[PDB]
């Protein structure tokens, strides 16, 4: 600690994300306190791919009531790293 490898959570599997695969960019959930500068060092270590323009987004949780008991969803924070051209994906593999 701190280490790049623990910063990531899970890949975001969405139809909107699958379209971004041809854009040479891949969404990943990231810790709320993490900065863009940290994410750039993660891909360079874990994937080894050169990093270009990283985008990061936060989401307020939606309500998910179960009978009487309402409760807010945890705040996810996915990141979008636009990988440089000519770089093999490790996603899905």
């Amino acid at each position: 600690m701190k280490d790049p490898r623990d910063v990531l959570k899970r890949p975001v599997i969405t139809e909107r994300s699958a379209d971004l695969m041809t854009e040479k960019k891949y969404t990943f959930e990231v810790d709320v306190r993490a900065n863009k500068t940290e994410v750039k060092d993660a891909v360079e270590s874990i994937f080894g791919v050169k990093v270009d323009k990283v985008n990061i987004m936060n989401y307020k949780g939606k309500s998910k009531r179960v009978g009487r008991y309402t409760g807010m969803t945890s705040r996810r924070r996915k990141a979008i790293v636009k990988l440089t051209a000519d770089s093999k994906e490790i996603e899905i593999f």
Binding site: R65, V66, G67, R68
Partner: peptide, 24 residues
Amino acid sequence: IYHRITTWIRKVFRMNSPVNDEED
């Protein structure tokens, strides 16, 4: 589906003009 439902009631008020006149 839970189909939970809730009902709320309130007393409120008020006016009192009262529009009453006489005797004077």
